[PDB]
Amino acid sequence: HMVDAFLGTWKLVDSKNFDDYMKSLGVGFATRQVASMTKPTTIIEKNGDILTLKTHSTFKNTEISFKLGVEFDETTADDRKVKSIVTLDGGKLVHLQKWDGQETTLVRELIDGKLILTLTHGTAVCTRTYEKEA
Ligand SMILES: CCCCCCCCCCCCCCCC(=O)O
């Protein structure tokens, strides 16, 4: 399964344009100040057809579980209540969130052994680079 290469624990080492991405979502200044300065850990697990993606940080934790291709309800780290779907498109794990007539896509792919997360909302595009910890 293509998901096997994503499994494990990943730690943020680099970020580009995250503040702009949060601004585009309406995250307030005080939260952006802290969120831009944290280095989250993302844990990706799979048991049968169910994938679980956990994001851990010193001040906020999220967890979602899903089957690929099946829409699910998600409450995001910034408290948006969204409709989500995740597909594995070739080698790219593509997570689409929809709410209030808006969308944002979170694409994860493996480049040179690192996990690259690209977040797009409107024209705000952010790249988050994660190194494999375990
Ligand atoms: C995940 C770090 C703390 C997040 C605090 C809430 C404000 C920003 C949330 C924006 C949507 C989720 C972004 C995830 C980024 C990532 O996984 O590197």
68: CATH: 2.40.128.20
Whole-number Å distance between alpha carbons of 114 and 60: 23
For the CA of 12, the closest atom of ligand 1 is 18
- Domain of 73 in residue numbering reads as 1-134
For a mutational test of ligand 1's pocket, the pick from 19, 20, 22, 99, i.e. the residue with the most ligand atoms closer than 8 A to its C-beta, is 22
Whole-number Å distance between alpha carbons of 29 and 23: 8
Q: Which two tokens stand for residue 25?
A: 């979502």
Whole-number Å distance between alpha carbons of 118 and 37: 18
Count how many domains the chain has: 1
Residue 85 CB: number of other CB atoms within 10 A?
17
8 A C-beta contact, residue 53 and residue 40: no
Residues in contact with ligand 1 (CB, 6 Å cut-off): 12, 22, 25, 27, 31, 35, 38, 40, 42, 55, 57, 60, 76-78, 117, 128
Distance 35 CA to ligand 1 centre (A): 7
For the CA of 62, the closest atom of ligand 1 is 1
Resolution (angstroms) stands at: 1.4
The binding site for hexadecanoate comprises 128-130
Q: Which two tokens stand for residue 108?
A: 């994860």
Q: What length is written for the chain? A: 134
